[PDB]
Write an enzyme that holds these catalytic residues in place. Structure first.
Site, short mmCIF file in Angstrom:
data_model
loop_
_atom_site.label_atom_id
_atom_site.label_comp_id
_atom_site.label_asym_id
_atom_site.label_seq_id
_atom_site.Cartn_x
_atom_site.Cartn_y
_atom_site.Cartn_z
N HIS A 62 -2.68 -29.49 -12.87
CA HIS A 62 -3.55 -28.44 -12.25
C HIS A 62 -3.42 -27.16 -13.07
O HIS A 62 -4.30 -26.29 -12.97
CB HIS A 62 -3.43 -28.10 -10.80
CG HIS A 62 -2.06 -27.96 -10.28
ND1 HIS A 62 -1.33 -26.81 -10.15
CD2 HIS A 62 -1.26 -28.96 -9.82
CE1 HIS A 62 -0.16 -27.07 -9.60
NE2 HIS A 62 -0.07 -28.38 -9.46
N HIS A 92 2.57 -19.41 -14.70
CA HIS A 92 1.38 -20.26 -15.03
C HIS A 92 0.13 -19.34 -14.95
O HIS A 92 0.24 -18.20 -14.57
CB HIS A 92 1.27 -21.48 -14.13
CG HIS A 92 1.04 -20.98 -12.71
ND1 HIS A 92 2.11 -20.80 -11.84
CD2 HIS A 92 -0.06 -20.61 -12.10
CE1 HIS A 92 1.59 -20.29 -10.69
NE2 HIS A 92 0.25 -20.20 -10.89
N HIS A 94 -4.39 -19.24 -14.31
CA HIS A 94 -5.63 -19.78 -13.74
C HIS A 94 -6.73 -19.24 -14.66
O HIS A 94 -6.66 -18.07 -15.08
CB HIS A 94 -5.97 -19.35 -12.30
CG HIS A 94 -4.84 -19.72 -11.39
ND1 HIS A 94 -4.83 -20.87 -10.68
CD2 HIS A 94 -3.66 -19.08 -11.15
CE1 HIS A 94 -3.69 -20.94 -9.99
NE2 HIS A 94 -3.01 -19.92 -10.29
N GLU A 104 -8.18 -15.39 -9.80
CA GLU A 104 -8.16 -15.75 -8.38
C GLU A 104 -8.45 -14.52 -7.55
O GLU A 104 -9.39 -14.47 -6.74
CB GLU A 104 -6.80 -16.37 -7.97
CG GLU A 104 -6.75 -17.77 -8.72
CD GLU A 104 -5.76 -18.65 -7.97
OE1 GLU A 104 -4.63 -18.32 -7.69
OE2 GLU A 104 -6.24 -19.76 -7.73
N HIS A 117 0.36 -15.74 -13.17
CA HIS A 117 1.22 -15.67 -11.97
C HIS A 117 2.67 -15.90 -12.37
O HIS A 117 3.00 -16.94 -12.95
CB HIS A 117 0.83 -16.72 -10.86
CG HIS A 117 -0.48 -16.44 -10.25
ND1 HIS A 117 -1.30 -17.29 -9.55
CD2 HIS A 117 -1.17 -15.23 -10.18
CE1 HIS A 117 -2.38 -16.74 -9.10
NE2 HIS A 117 -2.33 -15.45 -9.50
N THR A 196 -1.54 -20.24 -3.78
CA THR A 196 -3.00 -20.45 -3.92
C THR A 196 -3.33 -21.91 -4.24
O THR A 196 -4.54 -22.20 -4.40
CB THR A 196 -3.62 -19.42 -4.92
OG1 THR A 196 -3.20 -19.82 -6.19
CG2 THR A 196 -3.40 -17.93 -4.53
N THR A 197 -2.33 -22.76 -4.29
CA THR A 197 -2.60 -24.23 -4.40
C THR A 197 -1.81 -24.86 -3.22
O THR A 197 -0.83 -24.28 -2.68
CB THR A 197 -1.99 -24.73 -5.76
OG1 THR A 197 -0.60 -24.23 -5.84
CG2 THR A 197 -2.79 -24.23 -6.98
ZN LIG Z 1 -1.11 -19.39 -9.51
#
Ligand SMILES: [Zn+2]
Length: 258
Positions: A62, A92, A94, A104, A117, A196-197
């Site tokens: 992901h 990580h 996004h 995000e 993040h 957020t996941t």
């Molecule tokens: Zn994140």
């Protein structure tokens, strides 16, 4: 089937397996700059990353995580709205399929090309797994990326991506200093939110920096070459791995600046 970012398993479907997706303190959110409350009681953040020990980089299907040794107080975050010491465990990103999307959080509905993040967990809970079960268990620093000039400190990450192209691949990634990813200013907004996941737990104090960092087009292009799939499976590029903004509900965003 298993969650992802496609049409059939994307964010709008998560609530079926993770009902907390429709919770009262979900992330990300849009940061309305004119409604954020300046709070003079908030302290400056304290980022101590000079003893950080990175160990590995992993494609988990992901995103890609850079993992750190969190067995001792080596890279910690304290101050700001936090009580106690939070140890860095991983960072990580996004990102989007295009430069106009990817972050995000949004600022006055503005989307950035990507969002970094830095994830930290509250040492009073002893380990990461116990920390996620508590309302004050994690602190995530969010940093926006805009496309412009190259960020020299990001190049070592960009360069190893070819070796972790597909899900489940990992590579040794030692001696990476996360100080090369911070903006010059540490002014921020803060609010209580969630991962957020999935599992989407509401255990996060978010600290989102006002100042974005710049990355070059070529750098972000390399992110978009990763794959969601595992080796020998049909190729699905890893792009648009961001969750859209969620309702603020009964929450106030505080600013450390005016
Ligand atoms: Zn994140």
């Amino acid at each position: 089937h298993h969650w992802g970012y496609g049409k059939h398993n994307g964010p709008e479907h998560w609530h079926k397996d993770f009902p907390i997706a429709k919770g009262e303190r979900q992330s990300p959110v849009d940061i309305d700059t004119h409604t954020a409350k300046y709070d003079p009681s908030l302290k400056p953040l304290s980022v101590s990353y000079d003893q950080a020990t990175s160990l590995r980089i992993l494609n988990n299907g992901h995103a890609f995580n850079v993992e750190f040794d969190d067995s001792q107080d080596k890279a910690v975050l304290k101050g700001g709205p936090l009580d106690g010491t939070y140890r860095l465990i991983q960072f990580h990103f996004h990102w989007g399929s295009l430069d106009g999307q990817g972050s995000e959080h949004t600022v006055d509905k503005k989307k950035y090309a990507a969002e970094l993040h830095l994830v930290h967990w509250n040492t009073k809970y002893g380990d990461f797994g116990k920390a996620v079960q508590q309302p004050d268990g994690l602190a995530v620093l969010g940093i926006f990326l805009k496309v412009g000039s190259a960020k020299p400190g990001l190049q070592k990450v960009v360069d190893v991506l070819d070796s972790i192209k597909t899900k489940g691949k990992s590579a040794d990634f030692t001696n990476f200093d996360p100080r090369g990813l911070l903006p010059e200013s540490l002014d921020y907004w803060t609010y209580p939110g969630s991962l957020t996941t999935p599992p989407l737990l509401e255990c996060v104090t978010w600290i989102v920096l006002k100042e974005p960092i710049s990355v070059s087009s070529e750098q972000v292009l390399k992110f978009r070459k990763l794959n969601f799939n595992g080796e020998g499976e049909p190729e699905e590029l890893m792009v648009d791995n961001w969750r859209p903004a969620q309702p603020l509900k009964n929450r106030q965003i505080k600013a450390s600046f005016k």
